[PDB]
Scaffold this motif. Sequence first.
Motif, PDB file in Angstrom:
ATOM      1  N   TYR A  34     -30.814  41.536 -10.381  1.00 39.26           N
ATOM      2  CA  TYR A  34     -31.177  40.215 -10.920  1.00 39.26           C
ATOM      3  C   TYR A  34     -30.096  39.605 -11.831  1.00 39.26           C
ATOM      4  CZ  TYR A  34     -31.976  41.698 -15.663  1.00 39.26           C
ATOM      5  OH  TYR A  34     -31.795  42.113 -16.945  1.00 39.26           O
ATOM      6  N   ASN A  35     -28.968  40.282 -11.973  1.00 37.27           N
ATOM      7  CA  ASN A  35     -27.939  39.858 -12.912  1.00 37.27           C
ATOM      8  C   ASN A  35     -26.633  40.549 -12.609  1.00 37.27           C
ATOM      9  OD1 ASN A  35     -27.155  38.215 -15.069  1.00 37.27           O
ATOM     10  ND2 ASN A  35     -27.453  39.827 -16.579  1.00 37.27           N
TER      11      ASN A  35
ATOM     12  N   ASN B 279     -40.067  48.183 -10.187  1.00 35.99           N
ATOM     13  CA  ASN B 279     -41.494  48.131 -10.576  1.00 35.99           C
ATOM     14  C   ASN B 279     -41.994  49.507 -10.976  1.00 35.99           C
ATOM     15  OD1 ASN B 279     -42.054  45.308 -10.076  1.00 35.99           O
ATOM     16  ND2 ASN B 279     -42.168  45.765  -7.893  1.00 35.99           N
TER      17      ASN B 279
ATOM     18  N   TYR C 222     -48.487  48.139 -11.882  1.00 31.27           N
ATOM     19  CA  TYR C 222     -47.040  48.096 -11.990  1.00 31.27           C
ATOM     20  C   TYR C 222     -46.624  47.138 -13.091  1.00 31.27           C
ATOM     21  CZ  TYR C 222     -46.659  50.957  -7.935  1.00 31.27           C
ATOM     22  OH  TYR C 222     -46.711  52.016  -7.087  1.00 31.27           O
TER      23      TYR C 222
ATOM     24  N   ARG D  98     -36.521  46.031 -16.341  1.00 32.87           N
ATOM     25  CA  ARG D  98     -35.181  45.533 -16.055  1.00 32.87           C
ATOM     26  C   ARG D  98     -34.114  46.478 -16.603  1.00 32.87           C
ATOM     27  NH1 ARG D  98     -36.287  39.756 -14.049  1.00 32.87           N
ATOM     28  NH2 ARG D  98     -37.184  38.627 -15.820  1.00 32.87           N
TER      29      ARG D  98
END
Lengths: 58, 211, 159, 105
Positions: C64-65, C76, C83, C87
């Motif tokens: 995501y980055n 998750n 869940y 990150r």
Amino acid sequence: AKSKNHTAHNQTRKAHRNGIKKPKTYKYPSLKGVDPKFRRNHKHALHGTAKALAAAKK
Amino acid sequence: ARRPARCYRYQKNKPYPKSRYNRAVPDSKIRIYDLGKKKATVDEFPLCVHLVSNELEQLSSEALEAARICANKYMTTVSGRDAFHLRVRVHPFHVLRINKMQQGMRGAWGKPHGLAARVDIGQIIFSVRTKDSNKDVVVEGLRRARYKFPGQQKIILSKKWGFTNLDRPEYLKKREAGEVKDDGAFVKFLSKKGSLENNIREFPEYFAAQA
Amino acid sequence: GKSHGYRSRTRYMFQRDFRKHGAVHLSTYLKVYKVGDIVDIKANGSIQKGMPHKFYQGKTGVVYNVTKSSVGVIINKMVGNRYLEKRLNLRVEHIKHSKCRQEFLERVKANAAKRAEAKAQGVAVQLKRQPAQPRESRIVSTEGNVPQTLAPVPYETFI
Amino acid sequence: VNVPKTRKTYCKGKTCRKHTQHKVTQYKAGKASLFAQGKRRYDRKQSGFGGQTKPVFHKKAKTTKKVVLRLECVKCKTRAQLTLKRCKHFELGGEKKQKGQALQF
RNA sequence: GGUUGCGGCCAUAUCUACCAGAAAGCACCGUUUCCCGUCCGAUCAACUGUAGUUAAGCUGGUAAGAGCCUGACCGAGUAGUGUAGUGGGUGACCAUACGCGAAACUCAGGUGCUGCAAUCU
RNA sequence: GAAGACAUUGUCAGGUGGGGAGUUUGGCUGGGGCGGCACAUCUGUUAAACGAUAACGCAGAUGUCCUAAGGGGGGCUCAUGGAGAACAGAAAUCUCCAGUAGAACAAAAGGGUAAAAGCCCCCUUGAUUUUGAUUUUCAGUGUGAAUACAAACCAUGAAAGUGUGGCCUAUCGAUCCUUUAGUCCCUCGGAAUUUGAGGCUAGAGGUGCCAGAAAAGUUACCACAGGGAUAACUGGCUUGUGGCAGUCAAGCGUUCAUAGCGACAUUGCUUUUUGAUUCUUCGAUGUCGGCUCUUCCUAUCAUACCGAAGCAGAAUUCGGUAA
RNA sequence: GUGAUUUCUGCCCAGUGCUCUGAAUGUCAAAGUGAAGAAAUUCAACCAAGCGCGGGUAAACGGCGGGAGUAACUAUGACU
RNA sequence: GUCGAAUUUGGGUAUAGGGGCGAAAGACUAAUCGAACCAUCUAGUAGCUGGUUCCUGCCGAAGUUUCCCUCAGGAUAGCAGAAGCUCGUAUCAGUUUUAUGAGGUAAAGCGAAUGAUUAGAGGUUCCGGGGUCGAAAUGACCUUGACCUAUUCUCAAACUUUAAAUAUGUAAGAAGUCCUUGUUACUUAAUUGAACGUGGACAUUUGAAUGAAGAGCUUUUAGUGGGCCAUUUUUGGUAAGCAGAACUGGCGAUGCGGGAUGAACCGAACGUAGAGUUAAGGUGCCGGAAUACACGCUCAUCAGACACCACAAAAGGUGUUAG
Ligand SMILES: COC(=O)C[C@](O)(CCCC(C)(C)O)C(=O)O[C@@H]1C(OC)=C[C@]23CCCN2CCc2cc4c(cc2[C@H]13)OCO4
Ligand SMILES: [Mg+2]
Ligand SMILES: [Mg+2]
Ligand SMILES: [Mg+2]
Ligand SMILES: [Mg+2]
Ligand SMILES: [Mg+2]
Ligand SMILES: [Mg+2]
Ligand SMILES: [Mg+2]
Ligand SMILES: [Mg+2]
Ligand SMILES: [Mg+2]
Ligand SMILES: [Mg+2]
Ligand SMILES: [Mg+2]
Ligand SMILES: [Mg+2]
Ligand SMILES: [Mg+2]
Ligand SMILES: [Mg+2]
Ligand SMILES: [Mg+2]
Ligand SMILES: [Mg+2]
Ligand SMILES: [Mg+2]
Ligand SMILES: [Mg+2]
Ligand SMILES: [Mg+2]
Ligand SMILES: [Mg+2]
Ligand SMILES: [Mg+2]
Ligand SMILES: [Mg+2]
Ligand SMILES: [Mg+2]
Ligand SMILES: [Mg+2]
Ligand SMILES: [Mg+2]
Ligand SMILES: [Mg+2]
Ligand SMILES: [Mg+2]
Ligand SMILES: [Mg+2]
Ligand SMILES: [Mg+2]
Ligand SMILES: [Mg+2]
Ligand SMILES: [Mg+2]
Ligand SMILES: [Mg+2]
Ligand SMILES: [Mg+2]
Ligand SMILES: [Mg+2]
Ligand SMILES: [Mg+2]
Ligand SMILES: [Mg+2]
Ligand SMILES: [Mg+2]
Ligand SMILES: [Mg+2]
Ligand SMILES: [Mg+2]
Ligand SMILES: [Mg+2]
Ligand SMILES: [Mg+2]
Ligand SMILES: [Mg+2]
Ligand SMILES: [Mg+2]
Ligand SMILES: [Mg+2]
Ligand SMILES: [Mg+2]
Ligand SMILES: [Mg+2]
Ligand SMILES: [Mg+2]
Ligand SMILES: [Mg+2]
Ligand SMILES: [Mg+2]
Ligand SMILES: [Mg+2]
Ligand SMILES: [Mg+2]
Ligand SMILES: [Mg+2]
Ligand SMILES: [Mg+2]
Ligand SMILES: [Mg+2]
Ligand SMILES: [Mg+2]
Ligand SMILES: [Mg+2]
Ligand SMILES: [Mg+2]
Ligand SMILES: [Mg+2]
Ligand SMILES: [Mg+2]
Ligand SMILES: [Mg+2]
Ligand SMILES: [Mg+2]
Ligand SMILES: [Mg+2]
Ligand SMILES: [Mg+2]
Ligand SMILES: [Mg+2]
Ligand SMILES: [Mg+2]
Ligand SMILES: [Mg+2]
Ligand SMILES: [Mg+2]
Ligand SMILES: [Mg+2]
Ligand SMILES: [Mg+2]
Ligand SMILES: [Mg+2]
Ligand SMILES: [Mg+2]
Ligand SMILES: [Mg+2]
Ligand SMILES: [Mg+2]
Ligand SMILES: [Mg+2]
Ligand SMILES: [Mg+2]
Ligand SMILES: [Mg+2]
Ligand SMILES: [Mg+2]
Ligand SMILES: [Mg+2]
Ligand SMILES: [Mg+2]
Ligand SMILES: [Mg+2]
Ligand SMILES: [Mg+2]
Ligand SMILES: [Mg+2]
Ligand SMILES: [Mg+2]
Ligand SMILES: [Mg+2]
Ligand SMILES: [Mg+2]
Ligand SMILES: [Mg+2]
Ligand SMILES: [Mg+2]
Ligand SMILES: [Mg+2]
Ligand SMILES: [Mg+2]
Ligand SMILES: [Mg+2]
Ligand SMILES: [Mg+2]
Ligand SMILES: [Mg+2]
Ligand SMILES: [Mg+2]
Ligand SMILES: [Mg+2]
Ligand SMILES: [Mg+2]
Ligand SMILES: [Mg+2]
Ligand SMILES: [Mg+2]
Ligand SMILES: [Mg+2]
Ligand SMILES: [Mg+2]
Ligand SMILES: [Mg+2]
Ligand SMILES: [Mg+2]
Ligand SMILES: [Mg+2]
Ligand SMILES: [Mg+2]
Ligand SMILES: [Mg+2]
Ligand SMILES: [Mg+2]
Ligand SMILES: [Mg+2]
Ligand SMILES: [Mg+2]
Ligand SMILES: [Mg+2]
Ligand SMILES: [Mg+2]
Ligand SMILES: [Mg+2]
Ligand SMILES: [Mg+2]
Ligand SMILES: [Mg+2]
Ligand SMILES: [Mg+2]
Ligand SMILES: [Mg+2]
Ligand SMILES: [Mg+2]
Ligand SMILES: [Mg+2]
Ligand SMILES: [Mg+2]
Ligand SMILES: [Mg+2]
Ligand SMILES: [Mg+2]
Ligand SMILES: [Mg+2]
Ligand SMILES: [Mg+2]
């Protein structure tokens, strides 16, 4: 008076009555924790193409 | 003050060796494991008879020792001290503990109490090699040792040549060839792998393939 | 007392693979990651900075980055009956592209093909995968192969 | 520990706003002062009868104290605090650790 | 095909002993004014490419070589294991049923592949 | 008559004050207590090859240490061994070969590291400033510790870079209060100046029973609510210990293993030993010994009939049927 | 406090008490004093008893050691 | 016991509750004394014990997590009810398949590292010591040690190259795949890239199986926070109807058939009934159901007789049976 200490007994029974709910999914997730330098620019990037698309319906 | 063997017959615990972690542990009552004419050559003693466990259990070091003395004692005085080679095939590496005994069951971790060999089903306990012409004498040795051991063990005539890894003919075929060469009390075999050069040095009496 | 520090219980897990210690080969760093990329997670014990915690070992997630020396992966984790989104800021030495989708992508690219290559012929496609079907009839011959007849063997000792 | 009596480091003082040299020194508490509102309120509370009106701590456990260094920008005059880990011997004299010398005599 | 500079996978590239290497290239190799480094121009710095050499490096080949890599109904459907029974057994333990299935062993085969750029009888 | 601005008395102030008042006098725990700390933590194992996981389980560790033992750069290679050199020896200093780390990296241990993460040198303060996100523990709170960025200012290096303390996994602390740093900022409510006081933001003073009270004993003169969630007496499981019985047979017994015995081992039984346990009883099942009296068990002391002997007799010993 | 008579009541004042014609330049409250301040206040000196220092006291509370060696057999140990 | 005195005793009188009085026992102070009696504050507080009053219908638990001077209690999360709400072939799953990861247990290994362990054999010393020759020797010869080489027997919870089974992450499309070429302050030598797009192309064999009395979402609240058991994995303990963990299934909360009996085993889960068939277990008689069929075995002067289960072992037999 000592007593029981720990057990996981019965715990997944309970866990399964009302789920193990799957993880829930979205188009467009949050940019939460994304690089600020990116995000700053990206904003202006978006502002622009927005302006461009209002410019398509003049 | 030794507990009855009964208290430790089964393999209830995981191997508790003598270690950095253990340390203060008594000596193993059985300390020699090869007796009789152990200097003897492989050719000397063709016949081989085994004492063989029929149980998953634990043999004390003390009963290992007692047995050892029983069979060696018999085997010598009936057939001489150079007649046979007795190999205890089992070493007592597992330490047994004891809760010796203000307190009661609070914090109960044993102190080393004695040793035991842990032994499989089919696992050999003693092995003896001789001249064929001694078979009876040997088998009587192992039969009497049996009375020293918990659990059922049974004596089994080998197909192999002594303590060798080869049944009687295949050793013979290999020997009356060139491939075998005497070592201390065991033997060395000519490999077809490795440096031709110092392979030819060793085993001179090969490399004609006849006598 | 008990002990439950960050890297506890990880003796073998962050260990290094037999005869594979030392510098990490340079391809690990030449590899490139985009948001949406699916990575697999595996700690390189030689690299202490940017390490995943043990729980995330052997886990697959989505980038995501993308930062200077790291990628942010989102996994998750199921805590309880549910869940939550977690990150992970991982350095690139602890991440690799998953092949968990290669067969899908190979499947699709190829499904586009025989889909056009059929339509532009005269339909009749069939491109869902099917499970192993039972095998069919067949006739085995004896020519050169009469049945050898085995029996069970006696008991013997060899020892 | 031993730390240096001086320190090139960030000064956040409007004009300074850059790395400068600080003179380093150890924080020392500060005289009580009645007239502190707390001391004021306490003093009252303790009048008349009833005895000790407030907890008095006994169950001491620590055998140290975190050192605080006072860092003073010799240009812009301003000060900054910076607090060390627990240590049992502190000094900001010097006598720096030395190369590889003999244990003497 | 060789070689060089930069490499990727990082032993089929490593290790031990011996032999062979055209041409170019690498190399060893000459020097101490200059920048620079040393107890020592050995390393490191600079200058020459001139005065010399394939000895070493380097590359390759040999070896019932060590190691390493690959394979096989080689061992072994063995060990171990998920599932089943009011199965055997005093126990310890062990058969059986529907499945999953190693490791050592043994035998064979193999001993760097290759990307970019420049150069070369 | 005495005494005399002294005593006395009244209000504060210090000393003294179990004579008296009021209160307190940790937890877990194979009962409680003494001990220990499993009370806040770290490594390895237990732990059953994701994660989680217990016991007063196993082997250890933590309340510190470092201006370098922190940051950057260059150079270097370690433990050990072989072979060599005056005094010089097992061990001094010098050289060369070999050397996958067999060393070193403060400390427990486990990971990790070779032109380094180790050793030597050079230059340094990024162990700094701002406020968010994230991972572990998790309630998906806090605290500790950590990770990747953003905005500064710097360090180092030719540079790419690296540096937000110590290679990684432990090394620690709420509210109230005090104290200091910060802007020169807000407030003191009739309006100002100035002291003083109060706010805001970030630190320190500490709670180790470590989510964080301010705390000594005794009670056989004793009290209440409860507990069979828990001890002391009977009973139950267990049988280590105690007791009793075997198998093997090296020995003992002038000679001769087994008449009578029996080592080293090893299989058992018993429940008048003592332990281990804590299942029954704490709105109560009368605790030791004796006296009296009944009945049962047999592992038989005597008595009936036997078999054996290292049984001449006599006496004894061993064994059987026997309570 | 001890407990008729007879007899006898040893040594120890370091501690805890109790006590004193004791010393003095140590600590030490309120008031009072002085200093700075615009004052609120801050600092200082002086300083009662007490404490501390010194003496007395056991028919006050109470206490009243350890290790080696050593005499012509051994043992013991007057002696060290 | 004592009985002419520290004697007995009437009346009167004084002493009162943290008080009296005590030739001293915590004695006595009106059957009250280690603090009298009376009223009141007072329905004192109680994490403890006891009880808690009509029927039927539907749903239906927990003894676990985290914090607590916390351990017989609370808060917190979980499990439970209720009320629903937004939608609906949709989207869903204690399951398989396929593709792709993770792991260091079981096994295995030790003539592979570390650490243990039995045995010889061959080497090597200017050099650990002994001994003969000796003036010695960096002398030779025996010798026993250490090391070396190639072998041999045996091991590991806190060893290991290898390495399972069972468990475990992700993926299997419309939130998809491809083309064209806008935006920006980020980023590139660069309209390079990165992100977000506009316009265009391809539909249910649109991308595995099986299922789905639908899916999703919200609020609020009870009880619970002693658990115990069975198979398997498993720690401490000689052991336990003992103590403590893992996964599932149970009992607790649950009757019914079977195991005579019995919380947990086997079978099977409950509305009122008829007919049928069965499970587990049985069918001589008690007792419903063959004193059924068939092949062997076994004769016990303490035979044997069905899981859990209500025990027996080493060792022996010229009883008998088959090998
Ligand atoms: C330590 O001794 C006691 O506890 C004695 C007694 O008080 C017996 C006296 C009972 C009455 C007052 C009725 O006599 C008592 O409580 O007895 C309990 C009691 O009292 C009825 C019964 C108990 C518990 C079950 C049977 N047992 C017997 C008597 C007894 C004896 C004890 C014992 C406990 C019991 C109890 O510990 C040592 O010896
Ligand atoms: Mg308790
Ligand atoms: Mg209990
Ligand atoms: Mg509990
Ligand atoms: Mg087992
Ligand atoms: Mg055990
Ligand atoms: Mg006790
Ligand atoms: Mg005990
Ligand atoms: Mg203990
Ligand atoms: Mg201990
Ligand atoms: Mg036996
Ligand atoms: Mg072998
Ligand atoms: Mg631990
Ligand atoms: Mg390396
Ligand atoms: Mg770091
Ligand atoms: Mg007042
Ligand atoms: Mg200022
Ligand atoms: Mg040339
Ligand atoms: Mg010079
Ligand atoms: Mg030179
Ligand atoms: Mg140079
Ligand atoms: Mg050459
Ligand atoms: Mg070269
Ligand atoms: Mg080879
Ligand atoms: Mg088997
Ligand atoms: Mg299995
Ligand atoms: Mg079974
Ligand atoms: Mg099998
Ligand atoms: Mg007056
Ligand atoms: Mg008092
Ligand atoms: Mg009092
Ligand atoms: Mg307690
Ligand atoms: Mg307690
Ligand atoms: Mg106790
Ligand atoms: Mg204690
Ligand atoms: Mg506990
Ligand atoms: Mg606690
Ligand atoms: Mg695990
Ligand atoms: Mg947990
Ligand atoms: Mg370490
Ligand atoms: Mg380097
Ligand atoms: Mg700091
Ligand atoms: Mg915190
Ligand atoms: Mg911590
Ligand atoms: Mg460092
Ligand atoms: Mg701590
Ligand atoms: Mg200030
Ligand atoms: Mg003002
Ligand atoms: Mg105002
Ligand atoms: Mg006002
Ligand atoms: Mg002002
Ligand atoms: Mg002011
Ligand atoms: Mg404080
Ligand atoms: Mg606490
Ligand atoms: Mg809190
Ligand atoms: Mg706490
Ligand atoms: Mg307290
Ligand atoms: Mg009290
Ligand atoms: Mg009394
Ligand atoms: Mg007993
Ligand atoms: Mg017993
Ligand atoms: Mg006994
Ligand atoms: Mg014997
Ligand atoms: Mg005789
Ligand atoms: Mg004899
Ligand atoms: Mg007895
Ligand atoms: Mg009980
Ligand atoms: Mg009891
Ligand atoms: Mg009771
Ligand atoms: Mg009762
Ligand atoms: Mg009675
Ligand atoms: Mg009878
Ligand atoms: Mg009898
Ligand atoms: Mg005789
Ligand atoms: Mg008889
Ligand atoms: Mg009778
Ligand atoms: Mg009778
Ligand atoms: Mg007196
Ligand atoms: Mg008297
Ligand atoms: Mg008197
Ligand atoms: Mg005297
Ligand atoms: Mg004297
Ligand atoms: Mg005195
Ligand atoms: Mg004053
Ligand atoms: Mg005294
Ligand atoms: Mg009162
Ligand atoms: Mg009064
Ligand atoms: Mg009354
Ligand atoms: Mg009375
Ligand atoms: Mg009431
Ligand atoms: Mg009352
Ligand atoms: Mg309570
Ligand atoms: Mg229901
Ligand atoms: Mg508290
Ligand atoms: Mg209760
Ligand atoms: Mg799943
Ligand atoms: Mg493990
Ligand atoms: Mg194993
Ligand atoms: Mg094994
Ligand atoms: Mg292996
Ligand atoms: Mg080994
Ligand atoms: Mg292992
Ligand atoms: Mg799955
Ligand atoms: Mg589907
Ligand atoms: Mg369907
Ligand atoms: Mg439907
Ligand atoms: Mg609720
Ligand atoms: Mg609730
Ligand atoms: Mg609780
Ligand atoms: Mg609750
Ligand atoms: Mg069950
Ligand atoms: Mg209940
Ligand atoms: Mg039921
Ligand atoms: Mg019934
Ligand atoms: Mg029954
Ligand atoms: Mg079943
Ligand atoms: Mg009947
Ligand atoms: Mg009938
Ligand atoms: Mg019939
Ligand atoms: Mg059975
Ligand atoms: Mg038998
Ligand atoms: Mg028979």
